[PDB]
Amino acid sequence: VTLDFFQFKAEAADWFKQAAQEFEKENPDIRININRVPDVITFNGDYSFGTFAASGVFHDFTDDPLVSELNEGMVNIAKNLVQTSDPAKKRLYGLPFAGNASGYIYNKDLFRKVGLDPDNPPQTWDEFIAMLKKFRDAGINPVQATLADAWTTQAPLASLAGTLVPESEYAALKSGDTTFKQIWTEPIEKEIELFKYADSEKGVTYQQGTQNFAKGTAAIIPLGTYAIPQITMVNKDIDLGFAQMPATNDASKQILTAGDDVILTMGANSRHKEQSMRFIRFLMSKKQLENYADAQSAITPLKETYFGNKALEPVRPFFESNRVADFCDHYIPSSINIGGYLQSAIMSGNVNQFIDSMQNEWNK
């Protein structure tokens, strides 16, 4: 048989191509075509995933023997993404394959240039902003923006909201006991502040920005762990770090936004379920998982967490202490153009217009 493998992740295209070919060598009865439900699917762990899960597009993995070896936190993330109001319908419709974190990637060599300690990034908002001013004052571009790709603007919001806005607030928001004005004003104000320290053309693509950063022209790029491989492929010698973006001056209560970066699933109505499951068990072996995590600087979904790049060391404490949070935008319906509104808020500085757009679309 031939399996249709829908693979969402641009940054990992080569890894999955090679994994599939390796699987084919050992399984001559199975061919894998990488892109009528596809048989095997990778999807980002977000609202869209949850909506397709609730509609029955995906196989129900809840009882699968593979689950017991997985990080329970990541499994529950996947289950809670299901877009349903019935607690009982929060079933597992995919397997966590890799985790991420949102914050910022920084150039350790530029840290050293201005006397900052590359192993101890800023712990508070004031210290974070002083760091950017310090880079500017020293003649270094502090922040590489990538606004032409709207989704990238969601990262600093998600990072910041991770600490400022408890996930419980989204239930209060739906029931109308709170508002975007009340919960997202401070995150968006600070995201605007952040990008005032982008001293180069802000309106460039994700690829352009990752190229710029790799070539040493910016101190930080405020994206999550998923961007690391895009950077290292442009310059293998870049000395990179990854850090939590501190949203307040309460150093003791900082939280790291972190989610299921890749969920691996199967089409509920595949005609080749046995073969599909065989490929999925191959991808979910520890060996493959850690190999993937090394290639993509990701976090494995096994109970004994493996970090794929030493750049992630500064955020290890957040994971160990369970001081993490899922992305704010996982509570925002896909029909709401959050990306577009955010890119307008960042460029224009018009907070009122951003909040009202979010609130009115939500209310509807």
Ligand X SMILES: OC[C@H]1O[C@H](OC[C@H]2O[C@H](O[C@]3(CO)O[C@H](CO)[C@@H](O)[C@@H]3O)[C@H](O)[C@@H](O)[C@@H]2O)[C@H](O)[C@@H](O)[C@H]1O
Binding site for ligand X (CB under 6 A): 8-11, 44-46, 102, 151, 154-155, 158, 224, 226, 259, 261, 327, 329-330
H helices of the chain, in order, are 13-26, 47-55, 72-80, 108-113, 125-137, 154-164, 169-175, 180-195, 206-214, 228-232, 273-283, 286-296, 316-320, 338-348, 351-363
What is the nearest approach in angstroms of ligand X to the Cβ of residue 158?
Answer: 5
User: Which residues make beta-bridge pairs with 4?
Assistant: 33
d(CA 46, CA 63): 22
Q: Which is nearer to ligand X, 224 or 308 (CB)?
A: 224
What is the nearest approach in angstroms of ligand X to the Cβ of residue 9?
Answer: 5
What is the nearest approach in angstroms of ligand X to the Cβ of residue 302?
Answer: 19
What is the nearest approach in angstroms of ligand X to the Cβ of residue 206?
Answer: 7
Report the residue number whose CB is nearest to ligand X: 155
- DSSP state letters, 311-345: GGGGGHHHHHTT-EE--GGGGS-TTS-HHHHHHHH
Q: Which is nearer to ligand X, 4 or 46 (CB)?
A: 46
C-alpha pair distances (Å), 322 with each of 74, 81, 102 = 12, 19, 15
Q: Is 216 left (phi over 0), alpha (psi -120 to 50) or beta?
A: left
What is the nearest approach in angstroms of ligand X to the Cβ of residue 233?
Answer: 13
Q: Which is nearer to ligand X, 77 or 277 (CB)?
A: 77
Cα 72 versus chain centre, distance: 18
Q: Which is nearer to ligand X, 154 or 211 (CB)?
A: 154
What is the nearest approach in angstroms of ligand X to the Cβ of residue 112?
Answer: 28
Structure tokens at 113: 């240039």
What is the nearest approach in angstroms of ligand X to the Cβ of residue 339?
Answer: 8
> How does 299-310 read in b/e, with b if 16+ C-beta sit within 10 Å?
bbbbeebebbbe
Q: Is 63 left (phi over 0), alpha (psi -120 to 50) or beta?
A: alpha
Q: Which is nearer to ligand X, 111 or 206 (CB)?
A: 206
Q: Which is nearer to ligand X, 151 or 282 (CB)?
A: 151
> How does 172-202 read in b/e, with b if 16+ C-beta sit within 10 Å?
ebeeeebbbeebbbebbebbbbbbebbbeeb
What is the nearest approach in angstroms of ligand X to the Cβ of residue 151?
Answer: 4
Q: Which is nearer to ligand X, 275 or 357 (CB)?
A: 357
Q: Which is nearer to ligand X, 98 or 140 (CB)?
A: 98
